[PDB]
A paper describes a structure:
[name] glulisine (IGlu) is a rapid-acting [name] analogue, which differs from human [name], where the asparagine at position B3 is replaced by lysine and lysine in position B29 is replaced by glutamic acid. IGlu, like human [name], is formed of two chains, stabilised with two inter-chain, and one intra-chain, disulfide bridges, commonly referred to as A and B1. IGlu, the recombinant human [name] analogue, has been reported to reduce the propensity to form hexamers (a stable, but ineffective form) and remain as monomers (the effective form), thereby making it a fast-acting analogue. The structural changes of IGlu, namely the replacement of the amino acid asparagine at position B3 by lysine and the replacement of lysine in position B29 by glutamic acid, are what effects the rapid-acting nature of this [name].
Author numbering:
A (entry chain B), B (entry chain D), C (entry chain B), D (entry chain D), E (entry chain D), F (entry chain B): 1 to 29
G (entry chain I), H (entry chain I), I (entry chain G), J (entry chain I), K (entry chain G), L (entry chain G): 1 to 21
Amino acid sequence: FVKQHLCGSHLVEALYLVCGERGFFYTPE
Amino acid sequence: FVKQHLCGSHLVEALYLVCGERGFFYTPE
Amino acid sequence: FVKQHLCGSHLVEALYLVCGERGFFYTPE
Amino acid sequence: FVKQHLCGSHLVEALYLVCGERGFFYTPE
Amino acid sequence: FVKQHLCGSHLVEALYLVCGERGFFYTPE
Amino acid sequence: FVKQHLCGSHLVEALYLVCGERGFFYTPE
Amino acid sequence: GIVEQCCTSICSLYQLENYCN
Amino acid sequence: GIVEQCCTSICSLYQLENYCN
Amino acid sequence: GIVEQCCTSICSLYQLENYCN
Amino acid sequence: GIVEQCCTSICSLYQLENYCN
Amino acid sequence: GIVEQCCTSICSLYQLENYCN
Amino acid sequence: GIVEQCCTSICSLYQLENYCN
Ligand SMILES: [Zn+2]
Ligand SMILES: [Zn+2]
């Protein structure tokens, strides 16, 4: 798995891919 | 606004557009 | 609703979210 | 190009890739 | 990670998140 | 068809649009 | 919950605001 | 129109060009 | 224009409603 | 192949790694 | 935070798992 | 390469066809 810059909408899309039905929290502060 | 029909990653996109960098919780039941 | 920078494809995706079946015009000039 | 099957926000994405910053009209009937 | 159900452009998005700028092959059969 | 900057995920989404079931190679080096 | 509702039914952007941090 | 066609049938990128500004 | 209002500056969904038909 | 599998069935991110360059 | 870890620096999918429920 | 042609410079869909199988 590559390490890359994941920002904004792309970052929450990646959280969706990895977490799916588990859900996630996006709390950038 | 128009009502929404949002499945899968499209809901996450919509949460990002509503909340942004405030952050949000994606919480399937 | 947060105010945020919405550009390019992300901006027309947001127009789709808000406008839907009403349609929209994207005319950046 | 290949023919397209494009529903919902996917059509908007395709219009942006065809038109870009020229702008475009998303006009459901 | 969660298992994936990925159709159309969503698979391409997932390949980009797995591979990134390493590159990848999208190869329907 | 407009000429525009297509980068990262947006570039592979455009490759999907144009190539579809033919498949494609994304090999940025 | 909201995730189910938005997919099986319809939902509002106003409802989505309740999920911000 | 085009929006319907692309979803219920198939459509061409050539058709989409008629919708640019 | 919309780019100035929403991309270079910032906007929320209410301003975007201005560009609906 | 993978493209079909991920859509008709389910697939793993581990499988997707075999498609990187 | 997640922005520092993944957006300004770089991360892969294993670090993203930290933000799943 | 494709990055030079399409991301740092500009391209349209005809150049992208070069990377189809
Ligand atoms: Zn983007
Ligand atoms: Zn989709």
